Amino acid sequence: HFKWSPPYLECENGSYKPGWLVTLSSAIYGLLVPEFRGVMKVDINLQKVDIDQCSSDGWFSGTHKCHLNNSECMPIKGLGFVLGAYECICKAGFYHYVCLPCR
Amino acid sequence: AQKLAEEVPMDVASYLYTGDSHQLKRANCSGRYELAGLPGKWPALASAHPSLHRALDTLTHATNFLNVMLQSNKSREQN
Amino acid sequence: SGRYELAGLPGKWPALASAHPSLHRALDTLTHATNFLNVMLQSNKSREQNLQDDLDWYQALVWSLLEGEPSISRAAITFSTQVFLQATREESRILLQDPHLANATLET
């Protein structure tokens, strides 16, 4: 099979420039048996990649801003690989990161 | 877990939580990031944008191409 | 009768639409082969070794594509750049051998 990889940053011994690099990689199966005869891999910018904190299942989705207390998560859907992008709604009560009941 | 897991990368929490130029425009990194756990459980393109599928498609095309081509008999190593 | 009764375009819409997953699979295979070629045939050092080992490249390409692709009935690549790898997955061996469609390609 191939080799999944990890998001990155444009730096090894420098300041991480724009972009976070998620890689795809594979090992060139040789040629009457096979063996490791090469390795080919690319890396794309995993930095303009919309992410979801309030998704049922997504990128490590944690709705840790509006659980129950008149809670709703009306999130910020697609901008890119950015946090604090899950807006919450205070469901039928007061609003003073505060979602509150009615009197 | 996730909360305690936020104290992971210093001079990057701007790039992590703010996703900001504080950790980017001026912050000495000297090292690339690594989502080997900073992602979800593993999303493995099971929680996928289509672009994952597009990438894997071109991947697999080139992969089969070179494999069958190298699987051609009498591999010459004629580079 | 004769063969190949194409009711081309009588279909709802045309043969220019989007209706299926495997359709888009082959579509991706299609356009990525096409861009691959338009950049590959535009390559440098085009010695055009059409007899030494470029034939291995072409045959591996056309066979492995249906060895990778699922909608794998029959196909060809007939050029002189007829030098035809006319390849059709009979059972698992691409039956290789060397039209108005070519006329229309020359027209457009």
Side-chain angles (χ1 to χ4, degrees), chain A residues 6-7 14 18-19 27 30 34 38 48-93 99-103, chain B residues 1 5 9 13 19 27 31 36-37 39-40 43-44 46 48 50-70, chain C residues 2 7-8 10-11 14-15 17 19-41 55-66 68 70 75-76 87 99 102 104:
Chain A
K48 190 174 159 36
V49 180
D50 54 323
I51 39 169
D52 50 357
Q53 271 281 76
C54 285
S55 53
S56 59
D57 181 19
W59 277 116
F60 44 89
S61 303
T63 181
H64 206 74
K65 199 218 300 178
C66 49
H67 160 50
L68 185 56
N69 185 45
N70 285 10
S71 283
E72 148 59 8
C73 194
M74 182 62 199
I76 318 308
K77 304 147 284 200
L79 277 298
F81 214 62
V82 60
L83 260 63
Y86 62 108
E87 153 60 0
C88 289
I89 317 306
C90 312
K91 175 51 167 175
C99 296
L100 291 68
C102 276
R103 188 158 296 291
Chain B
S51 185
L52 305 187
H53 196 274
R54 314 173 214 197
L56 172 53
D57 183 29
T58 305
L59 173 151
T60 312
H61 284 293
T63 304
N64 310 297
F65 177 34
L66 63 91
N67 282 313
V68 166
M69 180 50 186
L70 178 52
Chain C
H20 208 260
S22 197
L23 276 181
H24 293 296
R25 275 198 202 201
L27 171 61
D28 308 313
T29 303
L30 156 64
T31 189
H32 273 282
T34 319
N35 303 285
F36 154 70
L37 291 156
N38 199 358
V39 179
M40 173 58 232
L41 280 74
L55 304 174
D56 291 8
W57 285 101
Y58 306 157
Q59 198 199 320
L61 191 65
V62 291
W63 189 0
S64 188
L65 189 63
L66 58 77

